[PDB]
Amino acid sequence: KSKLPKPVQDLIKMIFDVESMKKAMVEYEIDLQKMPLGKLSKRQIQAAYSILSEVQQAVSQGSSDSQILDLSNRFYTLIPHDFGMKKPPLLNNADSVQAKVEMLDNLLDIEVAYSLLRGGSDDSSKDPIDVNYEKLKTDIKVVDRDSEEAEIIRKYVKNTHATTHNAYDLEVIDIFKIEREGECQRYKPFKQLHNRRLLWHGSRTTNFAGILSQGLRIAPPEAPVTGYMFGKGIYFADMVSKSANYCHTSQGDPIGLILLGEVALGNMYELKHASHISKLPKGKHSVKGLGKTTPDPSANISLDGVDVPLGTGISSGVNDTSLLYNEYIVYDIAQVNLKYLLKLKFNFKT
Ligand SMILES: Cc1cccc2c(=O)[nH]c(CCCN3CC=C(c4ccc(F)cc4)CC3)nc12
């Protein structure tokens, strides 16, 4: 039976498991009993991205209101809601639409998770940890606990536990190091852009089955570039909080994955309200949301000339803005390299 170190095995059984896939889908409203995730298709999801984009032209451009209502009604058929009852939401504003843009994001990694699954195995020989983990195409080291490395890391969750989000408060269950296969290569280019930074990528867990196979990713062509504060790239945080929220760990599951990426920022476009891009102007190689808290300048460690902002909840001078913490974005995928995972226990304050 498996081989593997032991939270690697559990990591498999957490990130690879069927029940919870239904659970996300459920919380986006999705009507499992209409639309079973054997449905889930790259295909029917991609079509849905084009209808939410359909609604967007039209909303920012007047439109038949005899269009809008059916594009909503189109949005439904293809992605069946358990609603239900109660008065469904209209795709004729920015908000409700963006809402449905997350569900599809997620639908994407969840498909890739379950659809992942389906391959290897009447097997067995090679048991059900090493075949999933085998298909991850990723390798997983357990950082020892006592190490200055695990140490450093834990300062970083510490100090950038933020103010406002307390609360919950937070802790490190396991700490995995990762090379996924050949991502050195791709990043190669980007191993020599200036301004590189370890930042959090937090996501709902159900996601990491195909973030570990597909690498972190960006919305398809089909998707509303209005669906996203900075258009569609790849979003990242420096406070561990802004990211950790995205695990959607609740009172139970309270337990939840988070990435630490190397990211090749170079020249930061600094921004404060939304910019709907996907094209970055010339000479600029990432977007920055300029939230009012910065990780205190002061403390900024750098192993191999990546910066790490494990510095603590300080106030930036931006009052003026739409954010309260920073938000780094990069618009293609090569500019990222996954370094650590961490398993988190959410520990929800009293
Ligand atoms: C906003 C934002 C700002 C700052 C930090 C975070 C953060 O930590 N993560 C995420 C959400 C995680 C990414 N999710 C949306 C898009 C995904 C995606 C993935 C695959 C895919 F193919 C298309 C989109 C995955 C889930 N959003 C953040």
Name the hetero compounds present.
ligand FRM
The number of strands is: 12
Annotated CATH topology of the largest domain: Phosphoenolpyruvate Carboxykinase, domain 3
Sheet-strand content, in percent, reads 15-25%
Strand order in the sheet with the most strands = 2-12-6-4
Give the total of domains.
2
Determine the N-to-C terminus distance: 42 Å
Q: Which sheet architecture does the biggest sheet show?
A: 4 strands, antiparallel
Compute the number of helices: 10
> Measured on Cα atoms, how large is the radius of gyration?
21 Å
- Tell me the helix content: 25-40%
Subcellular location: Cytoplasm
Organism: Homo sapiens
Binding site for NAD(+): 201-203, 210, 217, 243
Cross-link (Glycyl lysine isopeptide (Lys-Gly) (interchain with G-Cter in SUMO1)): 87
